[PDB]
Amino acid sequence: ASKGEELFTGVVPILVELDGDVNGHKFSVRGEGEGDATNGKLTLKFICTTGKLPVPAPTLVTTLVQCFSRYPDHMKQHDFFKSAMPEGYVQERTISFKDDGTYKTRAEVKFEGDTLVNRIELKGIDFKEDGNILGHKLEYNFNSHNVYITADKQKNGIKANFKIRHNVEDGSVQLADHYQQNTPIGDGPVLLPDNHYLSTQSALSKDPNEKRDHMVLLEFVTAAGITHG
């Protein structure tokens, strides 16, 4: 276990800020909500603050705070994300949409006072104008996935790999391969984990009273994959 884990024993407010540029289309997103790591639960509402999104909101879910995962007691020595708090971590990804473009993301996740804040820059290139992303052909929903984590000792952090399945309006699936690395911002002690995964489930909905382009998100995340003694 870690001292950072103590910052998560109750409900913690969350702020998310994203600046994005996909094929030259610039946009920003702000999210607000709260997380309950004891139960692996978070609730967030995101608004596009610059107009409407040039990509489907579901493609931004993974970019828009894995410190809120529930780690079972026998796995708490493997929770890198909380161990890096409060100073936080840098989270970087390459997201490769099969037969389409790529997102590159860099985020800082840290406590700013009492609030857990995720600040992101996202750049997307090579998207097809007639593809599922710029063509807005993805359904407004989200599947359950496993996020596979391994230690990166040389960088004092972790890597992760997973493949998101985005349902397409024609009944097919658009795959989005995720490659992830996380490294501490501060220089306090961290936990470098044995291999394990996060089992993630998400539900998207709408605020009926919200006129701006937006997304309401509920997520449950639980660590797994290390057998209890």
User: How many residues does the structure list for the chain?
Assistant: 229
Q: What is the CA radius of gyration of the chain?
A: 17
**Tally of domains within the chain:** 1
Domain that holds residue 214: 1-229
- Of 187, 119, 199, the C-alpha closest to 157 is 187
- Of 219, 180, 182, 215, the C-alpha closest to 199 is 219
Any idea what the Cα angle at residue 156 is, between residues 155 and 160, rounded to 5°? 75
Inter-residue contact 58 to 145 (CB < 8 Å)? no
Q: What is the CATH number of the domain that holds 176?
A: 2.40.155.10
Alpha carbon 223 to its chain's center: 15
Phi, psi of 153 (to 5 degrees): -65, -40
**Experimental approach:** X-ray
Here the tokens at position 190 are: 């961290």
